Design a protein around this ligand. Structure first.
Ligand code: ATP
Ligand code: MG
Lengths: 50, 48, 105, 170, 530
């Protein structure tokens, strides 16, 4: 059930409250797309700026 | 001259001045804390 | 049987004899139901499934995995005086800006 | 305790307060002291000045109102609402020890203007403040005056000469 | 494992919320006012209370929940106990049903119907309750245990007073110890679910939900549940009352509870009475309101305040339920549709309002200001009507009265320090040279800003407004004390002078239409933020 909900969050079919973004740190603390999560760990500003 | 020494010390250890542990508990995501840190550094450079 | 006459013993009257009747219910296909001394006990698959589902379902609803950010408590700021000495005007602006930025990002 | 205390109705109340004071002194979060008083009034052992002073000592010496922190907790508002309870509600009048704990809290917190208020209240009530506290109060005042921290910054900011709901911070 | 269910019979007839239960077996007994569980389905269970037991074994029943699901052939079982609800600290922060069910959003069982304390268990009140509004805290004081009525027309400001009173407690409760806190319960009867959700979101916004709980009996919800809700809120409060804690309780509103009881009675063909009501509605509200009391030190010195709400019709206090509640309550807060439409908000009519007990609980610092403003308003009510546009007058009475009525125009709860000083200035004439429309700005600029600190007039030693912990010295010593009085006078004098010189003159100097609109916007903002 919860695993299915996690899979739905990664799929984007189900979203979090108050429009919270999906991140590995965010996901870890709650509990091709996966490569995008590991990317999500790294700071966005650092990636774009550098 | 004391004040100049304090600016040099503050630039050398900007993070030491802040309470890192409190802010780190508080922020769910590290990125938020990082943005706060960047703004403080820029403000000190503008001050001097 | 054991449950039957034990329930008959728990009853206020036990001097009287005990008779047992058996019936069939289409709606429920598992378990039995027993009635003695105007006391009913339900031990059926529909009823049992509903009870077990209530425990699991209620736990699942309490967890509320979907849409569950975690926010820690905030202590007093206790900002150092030396910081404030260097830039008193702006540091105030930055402290107000921080909270807004935390909510937006 | 040969003296016998009575309620407004004339019923007898018990002065035996020692075990509750022992519970207060053993506490490490200063809301449990209030919980002690709540369990104490139910036993018809209405608080005495010694108990309120133990509560004040507990508020001062304790680290937090509770195990977990609280938004807006102040040791001073507790150590003054309890005195309002002492004087107004219960009729008991505080002593120099009570105000002394209050002034210790104000000195630790760095608030110096309210420390002068506490000093003047002590003096108007015939109480002699401890000079070790008022000297530290004046020292904190000198510190705040030297660095311009005598007041916050948002007060000394120049006001908007033009009237605007956004400029006035509303 | 061993748990069993006791069957008392089957349903025979249903009529709306009411029902009749036929016994299954002779020589079976059901106790009176006991809840009964109807076999709705294999898992779903209803709940229903007895009101009469007949010679024939037939039982009258009031269905509290799941009336749409009840049918005739269904089983009926007996719990064998009174109607009880879970109560405690854990129930706080949770909107719930009267029975105890939690209504979701985006061990200790207390009795619903319990006798009120006797005269020896009670006590005259000594501590106040701060509604956050100046009219109430000044002239219509509210003690803890003092149940004071709110009367008003539809859309007049009745619910907002109770919500602001609940919200005002958060700022204090976080500071002081938990014993002197004011927890709160809010019973909504007959109200729309959207309004309850808005109330929940607001209380969660201001972080007042941790101290507050809500009982919901909407207009769509059945009638027995609406009749039962305030008794359940009183049950949630009685635990904190008898446990030495204090608590507040709100009823929005008892005028709709009576309609639900009228449904229940007339569906049972009970002999009606005045204005269609059975005649026992007085007892219905008295059972509820007498439970609100200030308990004796023998009983913990706790408290249970009650701010009920009642809907008049065309400003008529001579209705039946209104007088029935005034005959029970220890006061009255009369809000008027005329003043509400006339911009005065809260629309309290001081003449038709009174607090029979709050003078004992009022703080001395507030007591003196309230005596002064009471004299002032008793003069103002006469000086305003005696002229009837015969010839205007420029006297300090009418001036100060108009200034103070503008101060009473208040959108949300105010702090005690913020409440006194603004009225001290008017009673003592410091706010006489300013204009009417520039009173709110004055107050805002006095409290949220500090002109003396801004312009360097730092001659005062401690009296300022940026701290707000000075309130607890004002609450103990009083402003008329030798120490706070001169510094207060100097602060207010400097504020008046700097206002009249640097702000008011610039206001009068403005003549551009866009500037006047900008200023009116600022004044409407000051009318809210204060
Ligand atoms: N002091 C005030 N200032 C500005 N607006 C107010 C004030 N008091 C109430 N209102 C407004 O009046 C409207 C209704 O207020 P409230 O909810 O208290 O009415 P009510 O008496 O509950 O109405 P009803 O009896 O129909 O439920 C709301 O829009 C509210 O914002
Ligand atoms: Mg309303």
């Amino acid at each position: 059930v919860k695993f299915q909900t996690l899979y739905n969050v990664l799929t984007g079919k189900q979203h979090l409250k108050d429009q919270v973004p999906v991140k590995d740190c965010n996901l870890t603390a709650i509990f091709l797309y996966l490569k995008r999560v590991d990317l999500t760990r790294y700071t966005r500003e650092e990636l774009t700026t550098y | 001259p004391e004040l100049k020494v304090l600016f040099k010390e503050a630039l050398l250890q900007p993070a030491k001045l802040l309470p890192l542990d409190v802010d780190y508990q508080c922020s769910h995501d590290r990125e938020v804390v990082e943005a706060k840190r960047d703004r403080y550094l820029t403000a000190l450079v503008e001050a001097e | 049987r054991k449950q039957v006459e034990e329930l008959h013993k728990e009853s206020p009257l036990k001097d009287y004899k005990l008779v047992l009747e058996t019936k069939v219910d289409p709606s429920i296909g598992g378990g039995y139901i027993l009635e003695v001394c105007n006391q009913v006990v339900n031990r059926s698959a529909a009823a049992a499934a509903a009870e077990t589902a209530a425990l699991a379902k209620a736990s699942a609803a309490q967890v509320d995995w979907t849409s569950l950010p975690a926010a820690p408590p905030r202590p007093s700021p206790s900002a150092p005086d030396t910081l404030i000495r260097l830039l008193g005007s702006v540091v105030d602006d930055l402290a107000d800006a921080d909270k807004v930025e935390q909510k937006y990002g | 305790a040969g003296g016998k205390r009575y309620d407004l109705f004339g019923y007898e109340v018990s002065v035996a307060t020692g075990p509750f004071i022992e519970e207060i002194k053993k506490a490490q979060f200063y809301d449990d002291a209030g919980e002690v008083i709540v369990k104490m009034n139910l036993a018809n052992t209405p608080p005495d000045l010694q108990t309120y002073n133990a509560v004040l000592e507990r508020i001062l010496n304790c680290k937090s109102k509770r195990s977990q922190p609280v938004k807006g907790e102040n040791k001073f508002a507790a150590m003054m609402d309890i005195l309002e309870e002492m004087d107004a509600r219960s009729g008991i009048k505080p002593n120099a020890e009570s105000w002394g704990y209050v002034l210790k809290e104000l000195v630790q917190a760095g608030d110096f203007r309210l420390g002068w208020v506490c000093i003047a209240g002590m003096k108007s009530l015939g109480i002699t403040p401890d000079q070790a506290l008022v000297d530290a109060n004046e020292a904190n005042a000198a510190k705040a005056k030297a660095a311009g921290t005598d007041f916050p910054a948002y007060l000394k900011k120049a006001a908007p000469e033009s009237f605007d709901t956004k400029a006035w911070g509303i | 494992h061993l748990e069993a269910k006791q069957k008392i019979g089957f349903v025979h007839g249903i009529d709306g919320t009411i029902a009749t239960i036929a016994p299954a077996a002779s020589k079976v007994t059901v106790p009176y006012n006991t809840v009964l569980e109807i076999a709705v389905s294999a898992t779903n269970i209803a709940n229903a209370l007895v009101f009469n037991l007949e010679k024939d074994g037939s039982i009258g029943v009031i269905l509290l929940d799941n009336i749409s699901e009840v049918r005739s052939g269904q089983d009926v079982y007996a719990t064998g106990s009174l109607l009880k609800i879970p109560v405690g600290f854990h129930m706080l922060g949770k909107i719930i049903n009267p029975l105890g069910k939690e209504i979701p959003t985006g061990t200790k069982l207390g009795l619903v119907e319990e006798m009120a304390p006797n005269i020896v268990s009670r006590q005259p009140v000594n501590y106040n309750l701060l509604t956050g509004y100046k009219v109430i805290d000044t002239l219509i004081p509210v003690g803890r245990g003092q149940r004071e009525l709110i009367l008003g027309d539809r859309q007049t400001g009745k619910t907002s007073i109770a919500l602001s009173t609940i919200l005002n407690q958060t700022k204090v409760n976080n500071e002081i110890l938990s014993k002197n806190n004011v927890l709160s319960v809010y019973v909504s009867i007959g109200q729309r679910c959207s309004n309850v959700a808005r109330i929940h979101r607001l209380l969660t916004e201001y972080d007042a939900m941790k101290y507050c709980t809500i009982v919901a009996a909407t207009a769509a919800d059945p009638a027995g549940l609406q009749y039962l809700a305030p008794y359940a809120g009183t049950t949630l409060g009685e635990e904190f009352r008898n446990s030495g804690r204090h608590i507040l309780l709100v009823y929005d509103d008892l005028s709709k509870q009576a309609v639900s009881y009228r449904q229940i009675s007339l569906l049972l063909r009970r002999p009606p009475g005045r204005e269609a009501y059975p005649g026992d509605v007085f007892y219905l509200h008295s059972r509820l309101l007498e439970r609100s009391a200030m308990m004796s030190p023998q009983k913990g010195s706790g408290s249970l305040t009650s701010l009920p709400i009642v809907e008049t019709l065309s400003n008529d206090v001579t209705a039946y339920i209104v007088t029935n509640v005034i005959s029970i309550t220890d006061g009255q807060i009369y809000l008027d549709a005329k003043l509400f439409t006339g911009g005065q908000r809260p629309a309290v009519n001081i003449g038709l309002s009174v607090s029979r007990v709050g003078s004992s609980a009022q703080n001395k610092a507030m007591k003196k200001v309230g005596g002064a403003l009471k004299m002032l308003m008793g003069e103002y009510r006469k000086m305003a009507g005696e002229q009837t546009s015969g010839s205007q007058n420029v006297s300090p009475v009418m001036i100060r009265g108009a200034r103070c009525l503008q101060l009473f125009n208040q959108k949300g709860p105010s702090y005690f320090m913020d409440a006194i000083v603004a009225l001290y200035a008017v009673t003592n004439g410091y706010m006489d040279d300013v204009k009417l429309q520039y009173s709110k700005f004055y107050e805002f600029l006095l409290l949220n800003k500090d002109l003396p600190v801004l312009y360097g007039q730092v001659n005062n030693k401690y009296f300022y407004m940026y701290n707000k912990n000075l309130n607890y010295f004002i609450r103990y010593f009083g402003l008329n004390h030798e120490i706070l009085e001169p510094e207060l006078k100097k602060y207010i004098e400097i504020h008046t002078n700097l206002f009249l010189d640097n702000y008011q003159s610039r206001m009068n100097e403005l003549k551009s239409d866009e500037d006047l609109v900008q200023l009116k916007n600022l004044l409407y903002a000051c009318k809210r933020t204060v």
